[PDB]
Design a protein around this ligand. Structure first.
Ligand SMILES: Nc1nc2c(ncn2[C@@H]2O[C@H](COP(=O)(O)O)[C@@H](O)[C@H]2O)c(=O)[nH]1
Ligand SMILES: Nc1nc2c(ncn2[C@@H]2O[C@H](COP(=O)(O)O)[C@@H](O)[C@H]2O)c(=O)[nH]1
Lengths: 150, 150, 150, 150
């Protein structure tokens, strides 16, 4: 239940561990970033793997009565063969399920995985408990905080 | 003209200053990132502006003496109307100008601009001298370094 | 047992967790830093606890096969009663034990502890395996590093 | 009037520029840190210069009627000959005046200086306007901040 704080430095350390596992870079046609969470990790992977072909898939949700379903705003074409598909984390994997099904032949990776989402991805770096909230660095700032005493 | 070190935290400060200028978010259809340098700034803008429609333009460029050859590897469709197109930095403004020919109605922004490129972008945050190399945080690591005195 | 990289931000998170345990600040007369490793954690504790009385103990230690020779370069007076004495890390606990002989009534704390040293300190925040080297942020820099694939 | 945010990384970059100017390290007997602001910078200098003799001077203030005066809580002995005395910043230099007078033969340096304090120190790294508040990294945390839009 204590939030897990992810600094930019640490995110890049984890992403570089993933990149090393994705060598040799020549096996890949490109990277598909899951917007928005995957954008930064994609940037790091593309740099480390020397990959210039980077595209995106953009999904959002909408409610109708008591239900909630996913909408595709934009997608890279194809079934993902030869691609890495990257998101920042998988939690329960609702979006990851949709993404898997659009790109069934991609290698689908995240930085973080919680237990209920873990089966949906092909690789990930860091295990996080289901009840832990992951605070990513694009959601944070270096900000004054009062001292613990006085 | 010692290199200018850009940490992740400072890059985000600069990008947030750009995002504030781009408010209200409702003026924009989406963001196009210039891969690869624009991917991280695009993620930051997309978070700050609440924009899930993020796409890419991927180009390879090679200098042959006084002329650049441009190869488009992948490009987002359309003329850019209603889009922000973001790259990390402009030096000569050559890439910006090429991208702007592809997307002549986009609002083209960077984080850093050297003097030659400043007039060739719609907005930028930080002035950098022409002969200063900018070292971006996706090209760096936190690494041991020997003491200045042994 | 790959080295464990400690960024400045993460060091401060850990030190704040230590500072919370040391509340209320009124229980303490002051802080003694073990130079040099304890200087940065001491600054953090002094800020968090509102303690302006900060002193140092400076020792040089050289291993000669199986025995250490200790030279006190400078030491804060007294037996440590009412003081926190802070060092960055404990490995064997040899330094801690020596310092504690000098200040037997101090409350001796570190940020990191390897298993051998854990019982030889009053409090610590982070467990580190015995054969893991901790790389502290005062020994590191943000530095260019080549891509994993060229 | 916009606060000047100092990240840990940037503080160390500035402190290393100062350390380079303080070479050769052999000219110094040791470092005196001005508590509390000087503790972190002292830690960095001591590492970079290979200096193990680090002591402190600790001053506080007290009011009496409409006046305000300084109190010495603890001080290193001597007139500072052969020492570096370091504080994080000089602003108006009230404390710096007292420190100068206690250690008239030290080399008194800071990282930051505002114009009214600048004449009191022997060297500093970064000029800061009088009306700018410097936010040091021991006063900050990496913390959630709401997005600029929505
Ligand atoms: N990291 C880095 N890349 C640069 C710098 N100057 C130019 N570049 C790269 O060189 C390309 C050419 O920039 P242009 O001259 O077209 O503005 C850009 O994609 C840019 O990423 C620099 O100072 N630092
Ligand atoms: N940076 C770093 N210093 C260490 C490590 N292990 C031991 N040291 C240094 O070696 C000294 C001996 O530690 P001890 O064995 O006395 O606990 C300590 O001052 C400590 O700073 C490590 O993993 N990282």
């Amino acid at each position: 239940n204590e939030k897990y704080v992810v600094t930019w430095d640490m995110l890049q350390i984890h992403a570089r561990k993933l990149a090393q596992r994705l060598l040799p870079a020549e096996q890949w046609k490109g990277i598909i970033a899951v917007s928005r969470g995957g954008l930064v990790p994609a940037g790091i992977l593309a740099r480390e793997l020397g990959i210039r072909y980077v595209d995106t898939v953009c999904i959002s949700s909408y409610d109708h009565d008591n239900q909630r379903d996913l909408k595709v705003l934009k997608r890279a074409e194809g079934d993902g063969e030869g691609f890495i598909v990257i998101d920042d984390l998988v939690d329960t994997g609702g979006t990851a399920t949709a993404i898997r099904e659009m790109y069934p032949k991609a290698h689908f990776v995240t930085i973080f995985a919680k237990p209920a989402g873990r089966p949906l991805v092909d690789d990930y770096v860091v295990d996080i408990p289901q009840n832990t909230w992951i605070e990513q660095p694009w959601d944070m700032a270096v900000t004054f905080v009062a001292p613990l005493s006085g």
